[PDB]
Amino acid sequence: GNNVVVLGTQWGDEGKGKIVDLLTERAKYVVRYQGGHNAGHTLVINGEKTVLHLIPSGILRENVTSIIGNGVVLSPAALMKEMKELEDRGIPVRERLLLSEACPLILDYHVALDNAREKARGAKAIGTTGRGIGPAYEDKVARRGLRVGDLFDKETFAEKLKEVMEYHNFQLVNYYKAEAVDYQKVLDDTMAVADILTSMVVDVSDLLDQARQRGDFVMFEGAQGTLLDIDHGTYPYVTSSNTTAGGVATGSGLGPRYVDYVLGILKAYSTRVGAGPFPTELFDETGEFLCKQGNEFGATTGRRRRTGWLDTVAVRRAVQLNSLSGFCLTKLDVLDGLKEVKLCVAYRMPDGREVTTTPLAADDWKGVEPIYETMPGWSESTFGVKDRSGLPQAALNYIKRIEELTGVPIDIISTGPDRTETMILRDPFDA
Amino acid sequence: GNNVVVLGTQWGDEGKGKIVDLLTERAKYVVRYQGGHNAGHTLVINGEKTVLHLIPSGILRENVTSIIGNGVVLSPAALMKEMKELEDRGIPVRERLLLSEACPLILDYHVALDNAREKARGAKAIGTTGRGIGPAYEDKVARRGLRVGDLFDKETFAEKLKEVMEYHNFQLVNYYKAEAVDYQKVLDDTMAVADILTSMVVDVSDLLDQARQRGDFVMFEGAQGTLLDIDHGTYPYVTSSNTTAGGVATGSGLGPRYVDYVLGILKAYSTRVGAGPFPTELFDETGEFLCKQGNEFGATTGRRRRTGWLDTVAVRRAVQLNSLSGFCLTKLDVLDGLKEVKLCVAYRMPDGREVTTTPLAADDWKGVEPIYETMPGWSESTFGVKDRSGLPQAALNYIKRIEELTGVPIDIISTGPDRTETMILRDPFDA
Ligand SMILES: Nc1nc2c(ncn2[C@@H]2O[C@H](COP(=O)(O)OP(=O)(O)O)[C@@H](O)[C@H]2O)c(=O)[nH]1
Ligand SMILES: Nc1nc2c(ncn2[C@@H]2O[C@H](COP(=O)(O)OP(=O)(O)O)[C@@H](O)[C@H]2O)c(=O)[nH]1
Ligand SMILES: O=c1[nH]cnc2c1ncn2[C@@H]1O[C@H](COP(=O)(O)O)[C@@H](O)[C@H]1O
Ligand SMILES: O=c1[nH]cnc2c1ncn2[C@@H]1O[C@H](COP(=O)(O)O)[C@@H](O)[C@H]1O
Ligand SMILES: O=CN(O)CC(=O)O
Ligand SMILES: O=CN(O)CC(=O)O
Ligand SMILES: [Mg+2]
Ligand SMILES: [Mg+2]
């Protein structure tokens, strides 16, 4: 299809970046529709590594225009820092990035807040990346946030910033008894780039409508994961953006009816960073294996990720919220070595009742235990294999099982961090 | 199609209620996916009038189950008040309504806040319905709000309410220097219905997936209007929910790929309640005519609505954000009498530049003037006409023009408040 969405079916860090990058070989635009610089993606090409956050994953391809749609909480300071490292590597970021004037802005008071808020929680810490995503979203919904389009008029901008920072400074010093953020520092910083940012402004809603009428290929790049969805994730341990396929329409401006293929990324094994319900979590040696072996460390915070067995019951959730068309099984290779592996197939509720549907709010996952289905592993290596044949029977079986239990076909298998260590069994675009 | 969405293409009050009600004759479920009790709909049957707010518009039909999906900010006090008036009229509300445990709750501190916040703005008042929608949404996104599922555990509930109300009470008394909301009053009220509410809890995401696999007819009822969209409307004069087709996926749990027909409601003339950019606004006698004649008064606040000419340029916006399949022209009758009528076809920017695309943020509509296209009116009456033939040439011409200028067919024409004063030129469901 012309419009392909790529998102996480779990808690993020499944491997969107790699997949989107490899896939935009035939794409005209790549659109980021939610989150902010809390996302940490990792593309690896000829062993050269690039870790993006705010910038869409197609930025290294010169035949694609990267757009950050109105659903992204944009941080100028963060953007620039990113823009420069990329431009230093011979990547003309400003030649290829466009963005929406409707993007809220993440300024220092937000980060100030985010940390203060988090600290207040203590034992209840959500375990946020601490980028001010939450507050940026609050001001947004609470109709007081400043947007990219507010840089077009600086005097006006000064007035507005003035009444928002003070409101914020108040609760910061008075309630949190933390340090106030300086209005003049923020004003000076923001004003030093205002022009850089406004030069890249475009009307993304309309751009996408044209791209569409013209039949152009468009790819939407999701951040975080399904179970991090503000509405549908393990509340309150979720990000503040709709990570699910639905963010595509609210965050880009495209009507839902023009979404062709929803490619859910699948990591063959599960990770989670931050506080939150994680049924299949491994606290033992295998947990360590998966982690050591999968180099599981926050691409943004560098913090270790909790790891465990593949939770099919939860994945089945992702399939329905997202209306997935297909899957992309990432990190099948990390499984090489295990004597046997297991995947969760049902949940044993704390009242002895066996259920195959996930609970909604965090609190309801409390006594939930997973009922596994154990399978024989495989010693044969699969790293870098780019063709089904090279995959041992154990591997293809696990794979079909996943499909069986979910009812969604695996369309791409990732077997290495490098862009080419892959097998495209079906290309989203010509489908 | 099996899944039909019905929403406002303008600023709300176009006539969703009437249309949804008439349309659920063949529908199994009706789902409200956004907003709260700020919406004021008006169904009229055999002259009997019902004005709903929180309760979906299919409630009077006994063959349809009404569901308020997770995207709705639900007020218990408000729900009950509504539930009772309906049940008193011989409508078994609890026999037919289900809702999501994931609905945030609108309690008194929210209303307290909403008014305080609004007052602080003074001249900048958004002109909100004053129901606490905004704050309810803030707590939501800011991961501190209480949800329907939090009534399942009252001791726990007491703890949480405690830490949220105090945070709120603080800014209420200290910052706004307004009155604090009593924790015990709120706790007692909420606890007196907790059971009533929890008995109606269902897992809407899954319900819709079943309904879908089963081919059942589902209708999604939108509140407010497109241009009130938090992301895409005239920020900051917007509601805090995504009013656009996209709310359907984030607010119900249905994957965007399962949306079949998006029916945009169209009011043949334009109204707006609240502060906000309104290019075609009439401040003269015709303005008064449209208003008097269209009984244009806030169905929720009883406040008069600003009225004007049909803004096609803005409607064209609705078409693309929403990926509309068809239109439903409401209130064609109010036009009867006018010597001639006009519709806006382009915008004259304050720099002399003629443009056919709408500006995003409120501030950018500031010096925008509309370029009309005047048409001959019609004295012949159209009230209650239920067949094209009864429509004078002036009427059918205006109609085709609207289609011409938009590229979307008018599928239903409304010509009276009563459920039967209508013409279904194409039924969304068998399309
Ligand atoms: N072994 C292995 N590593 C992979 C594979 N796909 C991606 N990676 C790497 O795994 C990580 C994927 O997580 P992250 O960078 O957070 O991806 P995100 O989902 O886009 O954030 C990065 O370390 C990628 O380079 C794969 O199939 N095998
Ligand atoms: N004259 C006339 N009134 C209508 C028509 N359709 C709906 N109404 C009435 O117009 C109003 C529609 O606005 P509202 O009740 O806010 O509908 P909403 O969009 O669902 O909120 C109510 O007064 C309806 O009964 C129509 O074609 N003609
Ligand atoms: O890109 C991401 N990958 C994985 N988890 C994330 C990401 N962004 C946020 N989270 C998680 O979501 C919670 C809130 O993070 P926030 O998005 O910074 O609010 C924390 O548990 C984070 O670890
Ligand atoms: O159902 C509605 N109909 C028309 N306008 C609405 C409705 N709900 C909110 N608005 C408008 O949106 C602004 C904010 O209202 P709020 O939804 O109460 O926040 C005000 O201009 C309201 O009049
Ligand atoms: O790559 C993104 N990370 O896993 C998020 C974090 O570091 O919290
Ligand atoms: O029927 C809904 N109204 O027009 C909203 C309001 O009264 O503000
Ligand atoms: Mg990551
Ligand atoms: Mg109304």
Curated annotation (Swiss-Prot), chains A, B:
Its EC number is 6.3.4.4. Changing residue 140 to I: Total loss of activity. It is an enzyme of class 6 (ligase). GTP binds at residues 12-18, 40-42, 305, 331-333, 414-416. Substrate binds at residues 299-305. GO terms for cellular component: cytoplasm; cytosol; membrane. Keywords: Cytoplasm, GTP-binding, Ligase, Magnesium, Metal-binding, Nucleotide-binding, Purine biosynthesis. Binds 1 Mg(2+) ion per subunit. The active site is at 13 (proton acceptor), 41 (proton donor). Pathway: Purine metabolism; AMP biosynthesis via de novo pathway; AMP from IMP: step 1/2. Its cofactor is Mg(2+). Changing residue 17 to V: Significant reduction in activity. GO terms for molecular function: adenylosuccinate synthase activity; GTP binding; guanosine tetraphosphate binding; magnesium ion binding. It catalyses: IMP + L-aspartate + GTP = N(6)-(1,2-dicarboxyethyl)-AMP + GDP + phosphate + 2 H(+). It holds the Pfam family Adenylsucc_synt. Plays an important role in the de novo pathway of purine nucleotide biosynthesis. Catalyzes the first committed step in the biosynthesis of AMP from IMP. Homodimer. Belongs to the adenylosuccinate synthetase family. This is Adenylosuccinate synthetase. The lineage of its organism: Bacteria, Pseudomonadati, Pseudomonadota, Gammaproteobacteria, Enterobacterales.
